[PDB]
Amino acid sequence: IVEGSDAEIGMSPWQVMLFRKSPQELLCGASLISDRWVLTAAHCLLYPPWDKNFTENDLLVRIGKHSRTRYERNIEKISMLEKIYIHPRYNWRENLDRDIALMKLKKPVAFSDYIHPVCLPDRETAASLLQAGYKGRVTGWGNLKEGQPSVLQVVNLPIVERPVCKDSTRIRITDNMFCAGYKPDEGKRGDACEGDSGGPFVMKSPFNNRWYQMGIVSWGEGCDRDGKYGFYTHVFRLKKWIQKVIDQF
Amino acid sequence: ADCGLRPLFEKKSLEDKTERELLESYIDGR
Ligand SMILES: N=C(N)NCCC[C@@H]1NC(=O)C[C@@H]2CCCN2C(=O)CN(Cc2ccccc2CO)Cc2ccccc2CSC[C@@H](C(N)=O)NC1=O
Ligand SMILES: CC(=O)N[C@@H]1[C@@H](O)[C@H](O)[C@@H](CO)O[C@H]1O
Ligand code: NA
DSSP states (O other): OBSOEEOOTTSSTTEEEEEETTTTEEEEEEEEEETTEEEEOGGGTEEGGGTEEOOGGGEEEEESOOBSSSOOTTTOEEEOEEEEEEOTTOBTTTTOBTOOEEEEESSOOOOOSSOOOOBOOOHHHHHHHSSTTOEEEEEESSOSOOOOOSBOEEEEEEBOOHHHHHHTOSSOOOTTEEEEOOOGGGOOOOBOOTTOTTOEEEEEOTTTOOEEEEEEEEEOSSSSOTTOOEEEEETGGGHHHHHHHHHHO | OOTTOOTTTGGGTOOOSSHHHHHHHHHHOO
């Protein structure tokens, strides 16, 4: 996270760390949506241009952590993964369209004060909240500039108009993504950086006070560049794929 | 049916340090 701040303890109880098994290396953010399903970005698992094709064997997730350094005894958990599911129409070649992946935990995790699932956006929350000018929140342990934090970092960022997202890049953007971040003339900064990929973009509903995950940190041109915006997988638009996978398996 | 409600904040009627900035963007942001 760039230009964020330290999270309060338990501020993001749905946070998940995606590690490569060996050498043990922090790869990405992720999010807990139930006692055994974790949401992340497909490109955290499959990106050929970096010779990246992980399987369930290669990875672990750590849940409930707060300080990347400190080992939080009796607070943090570790889970191997049973299977991973990349969206079939994931398009890594052209534009990272449908940058979304599900990971099933080998054994379910126990909820606690520090481990709690986020909501998937329903149709009503999606229509009221996912609008330009409304701010969401991004969290992760990625780089602080384009420099690794101890404690989870958090930043709030507004959603940007779709025409403005399109004109910021040559990439062919789709309705399965949205972009967020401040504009150069709004005098505030902030963005997700590498390491933060696959982490959640959440918004708190004023209707019922729950937090919903509207986005997955997907791509951007560097980090926190003027006139550039973070791009986020549009979680609600891929909810039926999420639901078809979870019911199936 | 318990998603989105944080043990250490919503469940304790405690507000985190920056969530108000989000609520206010619903007023000012459009
Ligand atoms: N989420 C944020 N807001 N901020 C952090 C973004 C870091 C940034 N994006 C990634 O890490 C995403 C993917 C996953 C692996 C690296 N990816 C990129 O090159 C993807 N691309 C878009 C793209 C999509 C599909 C096919 C090709 C591309 C072109 O590349 C980002 C991009 C967009 C426009 C112009 C240039 C770039 C490359 S810029 C440096 C590069 C790197 N070497 O790290 N990427 C990043 O810095
Ligand atoms: C995506 C790719 O390039 N190769 C994968 C391979 O890594 C995986 O182990 C196997 C499962 O079907 O086959 C392909 O899906
Ligand atoms: Na920017």
